[PDB]
Amino acid sequence: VVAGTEFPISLGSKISTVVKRPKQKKRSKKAKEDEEEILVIEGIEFDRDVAVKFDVYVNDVDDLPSGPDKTEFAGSFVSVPHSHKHKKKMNTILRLGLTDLLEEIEAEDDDSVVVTLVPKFGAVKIGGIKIEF
Ligand SMILES: [Ca+2]
């Protein structure tokens, strides 16, 4: 488990972190219900000649971390190795839709969720994680 203020981090192993839902959800959990709630993984940085892949999962913040795995796949970041005429590195972002996922895991009443990042290959830095509309 990693605190939100621990980012930026090097994703050398599987990590999880508690991510707050958007502020409007605090007063009314159905605020902005016809808009997609989006998980944003910011400041993804790596050398372009290194293949990168990490997978993203979400679980209910109230689950026991010492208990069985209840994580739900949300998406993946993939980069294929390449060269670039004036950049050694790429600095990018990943956005994943959460609205259906939160309904499926039955966490739509919660104010935060747990986001797990699972590195598969490649050295990569993660700048930050947030949820917004
Ligand atoms: Ca819950």
Numbering used by the authors: 370 to 502
Show me the paper's own sentences about this structure.
Tyrosinases (TYRs, EC 1.14.18.1 and EC 1.10.3.1) and catechol oxidases (COs, EC 1.10.3.1) are type III copper‐containing metalloenzymes that constitute the class of polyphenol oxidases (PPOs). More specifically, plant PPOs are expressed as pro‐enzymes (55–65 kDa) consisting of an enzymatically active (40–45 kDa) and a C‐terminal domain (15–19 kDa). The C‐terminal domain plays a significant role in the regulation of the enzyme activity inside the cell by shielding the catalytic pocket of the active centre, and in addition it provides an indispensable motif for the accurate folding of the active domain. Herein, we investigated the activation of PPO1 from Malus domestica (MdPPO1) and present a novel activation mode for plant PPOs driven by self‐cleavage, which is independent of external proteases or any other harsh conditions (e.g., SDS).
